């Protein structure tokens, strides 16, 4: 459902 | 009809006052599903709709992980984006982000998205390819090269075309008594005298759900859209929406104009006019 | 950058006294995301207030709605007082049941 959100 | 997943995630910092305060927030085109906000008394992942209470404590807990999985991610992003813009560790900083995927009736792929920001304004964002980005100020431009060479961009595509339009269905299932549904928009006219012998009319729309509707004020058969005023269709606390627009006619002749409702709900746009 | 909420103020139902309903107070287009808000009944807080369907805009500007149920008077006012760091003064939004 909700994503792996990755580093800026 | 087509559906879609939007994820609205938001991270602010907060110096002097702890740690970040994260939140999450879910939708199925317009009513909300479920969230999770890093300042409750127990931050779990937690439904906003009856249908999500047909999941079971699994889902719930890979969800509340995940999240407090992304927690630390943007906490460390924060901190990261005060090095690319050389700004004060004393500042409080927002880093918004939207992500989801939309469908055709088919139930197949139609549009997949993911955007940053931060502070307000644009950061990154994944071109509609699916595979390249576009960063807007040259600190977004780092970013873009951290994803190139870790291939981010790849690594999302999986997650929107899989893991994405795949959720929205079983949600679009679990709940289509309540997601495909249309509720209808009950209208009328309200009346507002003004100087100068002038008159304000609004046109009310209520009760609606999808939230999209077109409003007009016609007069002879051509709107004055320009010369009208309406307000950002709202939620109205129960899971449907409403709208109002108004326009200033003279007085006395306010019969000669006419309000247009166009909704889903209803095969014929709605007309009304004012009612003595 | 800086944008002042826009605090709409309206029930669910055209108010009819005695009737059940719900009101609500739309908050939009602001930021920074912290905000106060609170629902007032006669000058008073009301406490069974919800907050929900949060969201931002294609301008990324933040929207919250906070809504309660309530039964409608003559007399009875509610208003939403919104408090948020574009105003040196809490800006309140009265209902306007002839609106």
């Given at each position: 459902a909700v994503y792996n959100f990755a580093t800026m | 009809g087509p559906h879609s997943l939007r994820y609205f995630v938001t991270a602010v910092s907060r110096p002097g006052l702890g740690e970040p305060r994260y939140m999450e927030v879910g939708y199925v085109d317009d009513t909300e599903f479920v969230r999770f906000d890093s300042?409750?008394?127990?931050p779990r992942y937690e439904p906003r709709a009856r249908w999500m209470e047909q999941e079971g404590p699994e889902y719930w807990e890979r969800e509340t992980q995940k999240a407090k999985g992304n927690e630390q991610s943007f906490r460390v992003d924060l901190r990261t984006l005060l090095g690319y813009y050389n700004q004060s560790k004393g500042g409080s900083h927002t880093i918004q982000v939207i992500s989801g995927c939309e469908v055709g009736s088919d139930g197949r792929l139609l549009r997949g998205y993911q955007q940053y920001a931060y502070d307000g304004c644009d950061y990154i964002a994944l071109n509609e390819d699916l595979k390249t980005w576009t960063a807007a100020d040259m600190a977004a431009l780092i970013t873009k090269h951290k994803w190139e060479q870790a291939g981010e961009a790849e690594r999302l595509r999986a997650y929107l075309e899989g893991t994405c339009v795949e959720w929205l269905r079983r949600y679009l299932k679990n709940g289509n008594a309540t997601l495909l549904r249309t509720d209808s928009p009950k209208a009328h006219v309200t009346h507002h005298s003004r100087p100068e012998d002038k008159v304000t009319l609004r046109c009310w729309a209520l009760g609606?759900?999808?939230a999209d509707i077109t409003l007009t004020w016609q007069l002879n058969g051509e709107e004055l859209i320009q010369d009208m005023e309406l307000v950002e269709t709202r939620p109205a606390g129960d899971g449907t929406f409403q709208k109002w627009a108004s326009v200033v006619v003279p007085l006395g002749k306010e019969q000669y104009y006419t309000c247009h409702v166009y909704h889903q709900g209803l095969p014929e746009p709605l007309t009304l006019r004012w009612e003595p | 950058i800086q944008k002042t909420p826009q605090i709409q103020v309206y029930s669910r139902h055209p108010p009819e006294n005695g009737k059940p309903n719900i009101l609500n107070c739309y908050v939009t287009?602001?930021?920074?995301?912290?905000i106060e808000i609170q629902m007032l009944k006669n000058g008073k807080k009301i406490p069974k207030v919800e907050m929900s369907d949060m969201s931002f805009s294609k301008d990324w500007s933040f929207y919250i709605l906070a809504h309660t149920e309530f039964t409608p008077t003559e007399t009875d006012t509610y208003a939403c007082r919104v408090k948020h760091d574009s105003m040196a003064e809490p800006k309140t939004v009265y209902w306007d049941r002839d609106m």
């Amino acid at each position: 459902a909700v994503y792996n959100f990755a580093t800026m | 009809g087509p559906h879609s997943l939007r994820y609205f995630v938001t991270a602010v910092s907060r110096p002097g006052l702890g740690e970040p305060r994260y939140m999450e927030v879910g939708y199925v085109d317009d009513t909300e599903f479920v969230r999770f906000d890093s300042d409750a008394e127990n931050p779990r992942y937690e439904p906003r709709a009856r249908w999500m209470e047909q999941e079971g404590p699994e889902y719930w807990e890979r969800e509340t992980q995940k999240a407090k999985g992304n927690e630390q991610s943007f906490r460390v992003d924060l901190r990261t984006l005060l090095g690319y813009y050389n700004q004060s560790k004393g500042g409080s900083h927002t880093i918004q982000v939207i992500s989801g995927c939309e469908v055709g009736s088919d139930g197949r792929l139609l549009r997949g998205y993911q955007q940053y920001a931060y502070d307000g304004c644009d950061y990154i964002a994944l071109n509609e390819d699916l595979k390249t980005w576009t960063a807007a100020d040259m600190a977004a431009l780092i970013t873009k090269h951290k994803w190139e060479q870790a291939g981010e961009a790849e690594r999302l595509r999986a997650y929107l075309e899989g893991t994405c339009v795949e959720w929205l269905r079983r949600y679009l299932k679990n709940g289509n008594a309540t997601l495909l549904r249309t509720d209808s928009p009950k209208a009328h006219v309200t009346h507002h005298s003004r100087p100068e012998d002038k008159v304000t009319l609004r046109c009310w729309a209520l009760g609606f759900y999808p939230a999209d509707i077109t409003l007009t004020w016609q007069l002879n058969g051509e709107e004055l859209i320009q010369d009208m005023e309406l307000v950002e269709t709202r939620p109205a606390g129960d899971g449907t929406f409403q709208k109002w627009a108004s326009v200033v006619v003279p007085l006395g002749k306010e019969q000669y104009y006419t309000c247009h409702v166009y909704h889903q709900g209803l095969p014929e746009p709605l007309t009304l006019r004012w009612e003595p | 950058i800086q944008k002042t909420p826009q605090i709409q103020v309206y029930s669910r139902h055209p108010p009819e006294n005695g009737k059940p309903n719900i009101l609500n107070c739309y908050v939009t287009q602001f930021h920074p995301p912290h905000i106060e808000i609170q629902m007032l009944k006669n000058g008073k807080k009301i406490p069974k207030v919800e907050m929900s369907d949060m969201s931002f805009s294609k301008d990324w500007s933040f929207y919250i709605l906070a809504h309660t149920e309530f039964t409608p008077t003559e007399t009875d006012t509610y208003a939403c007082r919104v408090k948020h760091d574009s105003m040196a003064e809490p800006k309140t939004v009265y209902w306007d049941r002839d609106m």
